[PDB]
Design an enzyme around this catalytic site. Structure first.
Site, PDB file in Angstrom:
ATOM      1  N   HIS A   1       0.824  -1.255   0.000  1.00 48.92           N
ATOM      2  CA  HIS A   1       0.000   0.000   0.000  1.00 48.92           C
ATOM      3  C   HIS A   1       0.836   1.275   0.000  1.00 48.92           C
ATOM      4  O   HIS A   1       0.369   2.280  -0.496  1.00 48.92           O
ATOM      5  CB  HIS A   1      -0.905  -0.065   1.227  1.00 48.92           C
ATOM      6  CG  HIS A   1      -2.048  -0.990   1.060  1.00 48.92           C
ATOM      7  ND1 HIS A   1      -3.290  -0.785   1.648  1.00 48.92           N
ATOM      8  CD2 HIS A   1      -2.180  -2.115   0.326  1.00 48.92           C
ATOM      9  CE1 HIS A   1      -4.099  -1.765   1.284  1.00 48.92           C
ATOM     10  NE2 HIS A   1      -3.474  -2.534   0.446  1.00 48.92           N
TER      11      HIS A   1
ATOM     12  N   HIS B   1      -0.751 -12.399  -3.078  1.00 46.21           N
ATOM     13  CA  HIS B   1      -1.770 -13.317  -2.477  1.00 46.21           C
ATOM     14  C   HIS B   1      -1.259 -14.761  -2.330  1.00 46.21           C
ATOM     15  O   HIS B   1      -2.002 -15.666  -2.012  1.00 46.21           O
ATOM     16  CB  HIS B   1      -3.123 -13.106  -3.189  1.00 46.21           C
ATOM     17  CG  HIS B   1      -3.703 -11.728  -2.972  1.00 46.21           C
ATOM     18  ND1 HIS B   1      -4.804 -11.275  -3.646  1.00 46.21           N
ATOM     19  CD2 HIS B   1      -3.262 -10.676  -2.220  1.00 46.21           C
ATOM     20  CE1 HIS B   1      -5.067 -10.020  -3.249  1.00 46.21           C
ATOM     21  NE2 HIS B   1      -4.087  -9.578  -2.438  1.00 46.21           N
TER      22      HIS B   1
HETATM   23  C1  HEM Z   1      -6.323  -5.927  -7.628  1.00 44.80           C
HETATM   24  C2  HEM Z   1      -5.373  -5.705  -6.742  1.00 44.80           C
HETATM   25  C3  HEM Z   1      -5.590  -6.061  -5.336  1.00 44.80           C
HETATM   26  C4  HEM Z   1      -6.728  -6.274  -4.588  1.00 44.80           C
HETATM   27  C5  HEM Z   1      -8.177  -5.868  -4.926  1.00 44.80           C
HETATM   28  C6  HEM Z   1      -6.262  -6.673  -3.269  1.00 44.80           C
HETATM   29  C7  HEM Z   1      -7.112  -6.889  -2.181  1.00 44.80           C
HETATM   30  C8  HEM Z   1      -6.735  -7.253  -0.865  1.00 44.80           C
HETATM   31  C9  HEM Z   1      -7.599  -7.319   0.270  1.00 44.80           C
HETATM   32  C10 HEM Z   1      -9.079  -6.920   0.181  1.00 44.80           C
HETATM   33  C11 HEM Z   1      -6.872  -7.688   1.315  1.00 44.80           C
HETATM   34  C12 HEM Z   1      -7.356  -7.989   2.680  1.00 44.80           C
HETATM   35  C13 HEM Z   1      -7.003  -6.881   3.658  1.00 44.80           C
HETATM   36  C14 HEM Z   1      -7.407  -7.388   5.081  1.00 44.80           C
HETATM   37  O1  HEM Z   1      -8.690  -7.585   5.253  1.00 44.80           O
HETATM   38  O2  HEM Z   1      -6.587  -7.639   6.012  1.00 44.80           O
HETATM   39  C15 HEM Z   1      -5.565  -7.941   0.851  1.00 44.80           C
HETATM   40  C16 HEM Z   1      -4.553  -8.601   1.528  1.00 44.80           C
HETATM   41  C17 HEM Z   1      -3.254  -8.738   1.022  1.00 44.80           C
HETATM   42  N1  HEM Z   1      -2.808  -8.370  -0.189  1.00 44.80           N
HETATM   43 FE1  HEM Z   1      -3.839  -7.709  -1.701  1.00 44.80          FE
HETATM   44  N2  HEM Z   1      -4.973  -6.915  -3.306  1.00 44.80           N
HETATM   45  C18 HEM Z   1      -4.487  -6.518  -4.462  1.00 44.80           C
HETATM   46  C19 HEM Z   1      -3.130  -6.555  -4.850  1.00 44.80           C
HETATM   47  C20 HEM Z   1      -2.044  -6.882  -4.045  1.00 44.80           C
HETATM   48  C21 HEM Z   1      -0.684  -6.745  -4.385  1.00 44.80           C
HETATM   49  C22 HEM Z   1      -0.196  -6.100  -5.661  1.00 44.80           C
HETATM   50  C23 HEM Z   1       0.086  -7.232  -3.310  1.00 44.80           C
HETATM   51  C24 HEM Z   1       1.553  -7.387  -3.160  1.00 44.80           C
HETATM   52  C25 HEM Z   1       2.440  -7.782  -4.102  1.00 44.80           C
HETATM   53  C26 HEM Z   1      -0.854  -7.599  -2.299  1.00 44.80           C
HETATM   54  C27 HEM Z   1      -0.578  -8.281  -1.153  1.00 44.80           C
HETATM   55  C28 HEM Z   1      -1.464  -8.645  -0.169  1.00 44.80           C
HETATM   56  C29 HEM Z   1      -1.093  -9.339   1.070  1.00 44.80           C
HETATM   57  C30 HEM Z   1       0.243  -9.880   1.459  1.00 44.80           C
HETATM   58  C31 HEM Z   1      -2.210  -9.438   1.796  1.00 44.80           C
HETATM   59  C32 HEM Z   1      -2.395 -10.092   3.143  1.00 44.80           C
HETATM   60  C33 HEM Z   1      -2.231  -9.261   4.412  1.00 44.80           C
HETATM   61  C34 HEM Z   1      -2.164  -9.987   5.721  1.00 44.80           C
HETATM   62  O3  HEM Z   1      -1.698 -11.129   5.688  1.00 44.80           O
HETATM   63  O4  HEM Z   1      -2.521  -9.362   6.826  1.00 44.80           O
HETATM   64  N3  HEM Z   1      -2.094  -7.497  -2.873  1.00 44.80           N
HETATM   65  N4  HEM Z   1      -5.509  -7.781  -0.536  1.00 44.80           N
END
Ligand code: HEM
Ligand code: HEM
Ligand code: NA
Ligand code: NA
Lengths: 713, 713
Positions: B77, B244
């Protein structure tokens, strides 16, 4: 575009501490206005101004062929925003040329007046500021029309962006009282720090309170607002009757003819406003306030006709051509000249607020004395005009040029001249050692010097440690100053002083004012030593001690701190959150956000809190100069909650055990909450920052101790 | 308090040019971040970060015993605010810790992630910035979980207040498209410069467009928003599937349990927010977005299980415990571990936006290739992650530390090394004389150098005169650059360069990039000479020439100036007034209001306007460096009116005779209209200002010429 202010409208605004940076200033960083002014040919400027008075421009033709009345009004509006409550407003920064004051309804057509001065400003350039020019032009107007002024000082440096001033919370220009953001409550009580009755007015409503034409009730508002600009009854009558010896008002037609104020006008208007569709829009057809009053039979000459007319006629309520309430002399002949048509004459007229001078009983007696003794009126008005136009300039050391009056006036908070050799560095060392040997503690030394120096406000350059006025009424009795502790510190200091002075040759002596400050420096040095650091705190002698007779006790009362977050003090419970009050005080002290941060963290650990409160004292080595305040505040091992008894006190408890570690106020905790303040606290709470903290603290301490030192400027 | 913004909400805002002053900065004026960082023990920082990853704090327990997932999202972010249209947002200033980004709904709970890093920030102090730490922590997270990163550069200096960015006009967080402030018009066209679908989101809505859970439609938004952050299809698939691979979402209960974001929370929350009344409020009960998806069977280890699951199951639309739309694997076993209970397992789950990677036909081919060849996926992801996190850092010369990758990437707009002796001062004087002897005019010389240097933007440190990319596609064909005139100037300059370089010994030569700038310096010197002033314009050699093969033409398109007030140019008709576009450009160039004022007034009289327009050319001695623009603009003998043909062009006529003197645009006349700008114009339009004007113009010209010269930093 949505902004942080939109999303979080009650979050604190730190940009008020970072105004007036070198970024917005067009002058180089070493530009010194005083030195530019000292070389101005002031006589030449005044000759140009005398010429201008009768050089009518067709885009804003001069009433009676003479712009004097318009320029006197211009200068009196420049000065007339001043509030003794905070020192903010006044003429001293030339803020009339910026928003909002350039577009306030009471400043209508003063845009034209400032534009008439452009060619002179252009000719003389940086050697005369707009701020100085506005006042000098008012003086020249008076002189051109036969009034001898008391004098003039230059030195008002120009500013380059709007000053951050609370002018009120109304969202409608000129809103009448009792609305959702009313500045009045109770029995017509005006909220501090305001000094005007309606948003966009200088002082009062010329038709009467909330538009009701009662001269006696108008008198009450005049008295309240003028007292809040530092003027008493005599000065008030002299100013209003002096001003309205000259010129006229403008209301030749309905106000709906008048278009957008300058900040709202189109780009083609080139900074001007209130363009009028009434007939020619100007001169004989001018509309400014909507009133149509010319006071005297010679509006371009000093006379005693104001009070002859006030007392010599009975007055009838009538309306101007724009519909405003005003007064006309019963049975009078047409004796007042027309401003443009030599074949027309008019009956005497007055404002409601003019009649206040006759129908308020206390004003009536002064008005009558001025009527019977016009010499007294002349002298009072000259003195008052000087006061009005210089009240926000600061000590006499800032006054520049060849017309400065030599008479010392009580309102200037005068400081006696130093007449003797000053202490040197060897003497300062000896006095610091005596101060430490007496048994005064770090806490006492720091708290007293803070109390002495932190009365300074940059808004009107009043206050500070010069003068030793902390030993006099009323400062010695202020609750924030801890009167009993203060008395015992001052008694010990005066014994040291007496002993040092009695031992000297050659006339050398030390003032109590200097000794208070020096004693505070010894305490900061001792605190650093307590923390294992070797620090010398800079000290500049040359303060002198003012007498009680040189210290006007009622005028001093506005300097009383009712909120001083640097000592964790709040005199009572206020509608304004305490952290907003802290930033306000930091602004008056001329501190940036990093300076306010360092300073507060250090004072907490040094024992500067009023009453020895433990709130924010986040250290186990009180009286030692460390960054403990920051390292403890930021410790995530602690959890904070408001207390049951008091929502404005917080308890900080160990997260794992629940044990109480500390307590704090909103002023303490804001540094761990506000995202820009917490960024600053992190710097000073880092493992590499102890030396930076000490040296930044000593810098800011010294800055505060010298705020009023215009003799060394 | 009612403010100027309240009274006059569409007046221009100059405070955006005066951020980041030395007043607001707690570090000294001599603090150099690069020097502090170069002595950081980076390996020691990474060992502390590696330990932190599995050391759970009870105030925010680590999912699966590992904070990795959380820190990757934190770092994504931080970088993910970036917009190619203006270069604003991104990770390069650490702005996630300030408003508004600290309290965006999409950044929920990243407050906890930043607070977990305080002890390490505190240990290392000024040697590692928050901005760098955020990114480093996401690299260390990846490494700790078995993913080999492409490298890391330090050098992101911390900032101390919020950046001014246009994030949209909506007044409600997350407002769905089609409201009164819709960021969408036509056929789902997102307004420039925005790069997210709803106010307070990073890119897209994880449920689907405006909440509609269709993976095909969500794919369109993903593609559009990622392209607006300068990522293509391959990079987008790699990033989303790579991210993800780790961690989980949080939605254990209804969202109405979640309290105030940090900027709105109470003072006791100490900078944290989204406090939840759902059960324990954390850990197994965490609520962040309201989604409850865990993507892989080993959320704390790098794997190719995201694509095994995506392609290995069919997916069913379902709801989380907070009611959000999400997807669950049809008929699957409980193979996904629970984040806190070792005895519980769960079926595979996906976001709508995850399934976009399979159901959009172009994504599907890339996803399939990555599924079949996970080594290609790992390499794509590593590369993309580096790009994502470094895209706003600027030239490779700013990259610090021992992990900087040696491969030079096309998106970095690379500049070749200089391998030869540079020209000296005597050589520079000889080249300036040859340029002026060629017959190139002041206008051509100033215009060309301005066109080359003024592509710089401080938001992402792209552009500038280094590289001589003005000679290449697409810069050489931009309409603002006057392609035919540009070609003829460049031809003449290249003949000079060839002659100079052919005559040297010892390998000394001059780049065309350096000579374009130096030729502009000669033009400014000559203009000063035309006005009777001898000045030297400073010049620093060392620029190099980039090739066409080192220049990505499509990525360069965002640097095209479509509004350049400094050349009185507007490519078409926009919603936004031209004066607002000028201030926006000034901000990108890093100019103060005084710098912008001087610079504009000088360019006008030098002949810098596109197309030789006479608008704002208020001089009778064009090509001479004087203050004529300001003297004539401020002349009250001229009256200005909008033309019949065009409301945005104004005619300036003699007030007395009606004769046409000048024409100007809104950009010209704002300097006589805005109260803060006119105050600056007055300084330069004064009779004493000719020397100051020339000095200040040469300083700002030089500042612009050096904006990208991070090799001399
Ligand atoms: C279309 C693009 C994206 C969407 C809509 C999206 C959406 C989300 C959402 C909704 C969450 C959950 C947040 C929570 O409730 O804790 C999240 C978690 C996460 N996203 Fe994404 N994401 C996107 C792209 C990315 C990218 C580009 C990365 C990194 C390279 C990333 C890495 C992560 C990680 C590591 C988590 C997990 C966080 C945790 O373990 O607490 N995402 N994502
Ligand atoms: C209760 C306090 C006062 C009230 C309500 C007030 C009200 C006004 C009003 C309504 C105008 C007419 C503006 C227009 O329509 O052009 C005005 C004019 C003026 N006032 Fe005052 N006044 C106050 C005090 C002052 C004081 C202290 C001075 C100066 C010492 C001053 C000097 C002037 C002068 C010279 C004009 C004439 C302007 C011209 O000739 O263009 N007044 N006053
Ligand atoms: Na003031
Ligand atoms: Na950026």
């Amino acid at each position: 575009g949505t902004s942080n202010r939109d999303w979080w409208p009650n979050q604190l605004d730190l940009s008020i501490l970072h105004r007036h940076s070198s970024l917005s200033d067009p002058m180089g960083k070493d530009f010194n206005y005083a030195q530019a002014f000292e070389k101005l040919d002031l006589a030449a400027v005044k000759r140009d101004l005398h010429a201008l008075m009768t050089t009518s421009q067709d885009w804003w033709p001069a009433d009676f062929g003479h712009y004097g009345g318009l320029f006197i009004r211009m200068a009196w509006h420049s000065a007339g925003t001043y509030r003794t409550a905070d020192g903010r407003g006044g003429a001293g920064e030339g803020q009339q040329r910026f928003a909002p004051l350039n577009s306030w309804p009471d400043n209508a057509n003063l845009d034209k007046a400032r534009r008439l001065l452009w060619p002179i400003k252009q000719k003389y350039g940086r050697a005369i500021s707009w701020a100085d020019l506005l006042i000098l032009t008012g003086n020249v107007a008076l002189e051109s029309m036969g009034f001898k002024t008391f004098g003039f000082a230059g030195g008002r440096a120009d500013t380059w962006e709007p000053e951050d001033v609370y002018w009120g919370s109304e969202k409608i220009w000129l809103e009448l009282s009792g609305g959702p953001n009313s500045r009045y409550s109770g029995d017509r009580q005006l909220e501090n720090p305001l000094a005007a009755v309606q948003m966009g007015l200088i002082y009062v409503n010329p038709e009467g309170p909330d538009g009701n034409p009662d001269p006696v009730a108008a008198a009450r508002d005049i008295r309240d607002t003028f007292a809040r600009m530092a003027m008493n009854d005599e000065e008030t009558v002299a100013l209003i009757a002096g001003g309205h010896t000259f010129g006229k008002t403008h209301g030749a037609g309905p106000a709906s003819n008048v278009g957008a104020e300058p900040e709202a006008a189109g780009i083609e208007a080139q900074g001007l406003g209130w363009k009028s569709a009434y007939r020619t829009g100007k001169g004989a057809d001018a509309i400014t306030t909507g009133l149509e009053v010319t006071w005297t039979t010679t509006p371009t000459q000093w006379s005693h006709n104001f009070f002859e007319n006030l007392f010599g006629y009975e007055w009838e309520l009538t309306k101007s051509p724009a519909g405003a309430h005003q007064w006309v002399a019963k049975g009078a002949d047409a004796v007042i000249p027309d401003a443009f048509d030599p074949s027309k004459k008019h009956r005497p007229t007055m404002l409601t607020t003019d009649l206040s001078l006759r129908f308020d009983p206390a004003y009536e007696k002064i008005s009558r004395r001025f009527h019977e003794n016009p010499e007294q009126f002349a002298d009072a008005f000259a003195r008052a005009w000087f006061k009005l136009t210089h009240r926000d300039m600061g000590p006499r050391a800032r006054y520049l040029g060849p017309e400065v009056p030599a008479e010392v006036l009580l309102w200037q908070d005068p400081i006696p001249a130093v007449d003797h050799p000053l202490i040197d560095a060897a003497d300062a060392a000896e006095l610091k050692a005596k101060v430490l040997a007496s048994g005064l503690t770090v806490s006492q030394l720091v708290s007293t010097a803070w109390a002495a120096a932190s009365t300074f406000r940059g808004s009107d350059k009043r206050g500070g440690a010069n003068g030793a006025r902390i030993r006099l009424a009323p400062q010695k009795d202020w609750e924030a100053n801890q009167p009993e502790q203060l008395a015992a510190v001052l008694e010990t200091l005066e014994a040291i002083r007496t002993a040092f002075n009695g031992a000297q040759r050659g006339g050398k002596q030390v003032s109590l004012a200097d000794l208070i400050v020096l004693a505070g420096c010894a305490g900061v040095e001792q605190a650093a030593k307590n923390a294992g650091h070797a620090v010398t705190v800079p000290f500049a002698p040359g303060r002198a001690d003012a007498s009680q007779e040189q210290t006007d006790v009622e005028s001093m009362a506005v300097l009383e701190p009712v909120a001083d977050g640097f000592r964790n003090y709040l005199k009572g419970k206020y509608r304004v959150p305490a952290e907003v009050l802290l930033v306000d005080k930091a602004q008056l002290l001329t501190l940036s956000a990093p300076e306010m941060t360092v300073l507060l963290g250090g004072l907490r650990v040094l024992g500067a809190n009023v009453g020895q409160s433990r709130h924010g004292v986040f250290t186990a080595r009180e009286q030692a100069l460390t960054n403990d305040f920051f390292v403890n505040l930021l410790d995530m091992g602690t959890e904070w909650k408001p207390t049951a008894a008091d929502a404005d006190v917080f308890e900080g408890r160990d997260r794992a055990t629940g044990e109480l570690k500390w307590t704090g106020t909103r002023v303490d905790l804001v540094f761990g909450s506000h995202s820009q303040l917490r960024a600053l606290a992190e710097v000073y709470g880092s493992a590499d920052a102890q030396e930076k903290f000490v040296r930044d603290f000593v810098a800011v301490w010294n800055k505060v101790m010298n705020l009023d030192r215009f003799d060394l400027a």
